[PDB]
Design a protein around this ligand. Sequence first.
Ligand SMILES: CCC[C@H](CC)Oc1ccc(C(C)(C)C)cc1NC(=O)c1nnn(-c2cc(OC)ccc2OC)c1C
Ligand SMILES: CCC[C@H](CC)Oc1ccc(C(C)(C)C)cc1NC(=O)c1nnn(-c2cc(OC)ccc2OC)c1C
Lengths: 268, 273
Amino acid sequence: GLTEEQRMMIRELMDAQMKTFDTTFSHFKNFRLPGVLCSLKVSLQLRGEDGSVWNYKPPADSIFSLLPHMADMSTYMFKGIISFAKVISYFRDLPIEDQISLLKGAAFELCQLRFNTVFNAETGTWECGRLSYCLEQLLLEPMLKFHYMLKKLQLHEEEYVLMQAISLFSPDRPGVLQHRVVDQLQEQFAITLKSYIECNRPQPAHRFLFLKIMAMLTELRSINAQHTQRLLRIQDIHPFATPLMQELFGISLTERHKILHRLLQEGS
Amino acid sequence: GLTEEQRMMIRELMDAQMKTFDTTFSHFKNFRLPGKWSQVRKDLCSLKVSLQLRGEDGSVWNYKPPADKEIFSLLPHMADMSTYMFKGIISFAKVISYFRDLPIEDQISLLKGAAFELCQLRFNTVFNAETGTWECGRLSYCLEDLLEPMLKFHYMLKKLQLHEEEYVLMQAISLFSPDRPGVLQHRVVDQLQEQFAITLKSYIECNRPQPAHRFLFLKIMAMLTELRSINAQHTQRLLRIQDIHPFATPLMQELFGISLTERHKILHRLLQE
Ligand SMILES: CCC[C@H](CC)Oc1ccc(C(C)(C)C)cc1NC(=O)c1nnn(-c2cc(OC)ccc2OC)c1C
Ligand SMILES: CCC[C@H](CC)Oc1ccc(C(C)(C)C)cc1NC(=O)c1nnn(-c2cc(OC)ccc2OC)c1C
């Protein structure tokens, strides 16, 4: 039994998730594709409305071909992440600078949390509806070990959307001014998540699940730093980042993120 | 043991083939790709193919066709494929001396009736029987699901294991068909076809064992007869489909029939340059 606010807090996040998560990627169009890292090698599949199936197999040892597509696809995911935060009441009340700082530090993490919901552990494929991404002693790349472990927990929709709230309202993000207001918000999401697990998962397989989930968020925070550095090493060599990704990567706060600033003011 | 004219007759067709047959399809670019109604779905089910497209880096794009507007996806591509092939078929005839000396209308009539047949003969050279795939260099076409006469023709012709000289002689016999619609020089073309047929019959005797290839010439002639029937069949199927869904290129519309040189001005223009 949750409090009348904890129940109201989850319904707001679940409604926020339903309104902003395009699980089928139906509105994901006008993206780049390979024209006619070694652990994260993926094979792109693209199904059509008529039932046709395009399949792209990347070449072997010679790798920057799929990055333009993965940049466009991740940008579309982050646009839904922005809209997810805009409809949360606790997020819109924050200053416009903290909304940019929180979305800068939680862009990658909230994308991963949504990808794990469409990840297939048995087939190794990220079933993104229209598109699919199938992989080619391999769960050492922290990106994939995180997804396989998180998928093993078999979390609910309420638990996934609560991890997004805890990751979004991180008080120790670079540039956050209201560090105490964000920390007060983050504590309530963790309390609601801890209370939800106790009321709906009495099984022994889900023992210490809240501490496991919090440990995943800490690991995902470390993987966020690793991948951001790995992608800046490639951007320095081969420019592949989208205009919105350059603002996140850091390539006066609202003046350096004019796209993020405009998206936070439009009607959600 | 061929005559010096039969020897020079083959040397001209081989030079004709090597100048106009892009066996690697290196110059086939800028083609379309996948982005009375009941009478169409028949042949489409028999000729369902999966397109493969390799890249310079080694990447492989593959298009699997949608299972049973459903099969109209490969039509724009195969129209560009057929058009590119036929333009090389036109260039093949434009360098043959016996073809240039014919009237400009008889040249159009021969190319109209032998367009499909000469295109199949070149497609059989790049067909892989054990894998069932037309290996067109960067492009590949593998079918799924020998009942279709066009498929039975390719499997039977590939089993004969003909030479490059025997393939180019089949193109000469099929090109110089005197009974094509609109041909005026029935006496000249029929005598030309006999000269190529005699050379093919004499080539098999002089360059192959006698008893094992005793009826190889008659088998080849039987293939051209069966291929002549498939040319009629396939032309009717695509006229039923083109009338419903336009997929034919302007050069294909002239062949399909959609004053002789004025109704085939594109084919005429390609014969003048
Ligand atoms: C399991 C993770 C999902 C994805 C498959 C569904 O896995 C990949 C697999 C293969 C590849 C390559 C090797 C083919 C390129 C890449 C990725 N994944 C990214 O490329 C990615 N993941 N997150 N972000 C991201 C987004 C962002 O907002 C726009 C800001 C910063 C971001 O990175 C700090 C990005 C760009
Ligand atoms: C058998 C080898 C060809 C090709 C390659 C594997 O197999 C096909 C496979 C599938 C398909 C569909 C049904 C899925 C589209 C078609 C075809 N092949 C044709 O559609 C074709 N073959 N020849 N011609 C042709 C050309 C011409 O010159 C311009 C004039 C008249 C012609 O037909 C009267 C055409 C149009």
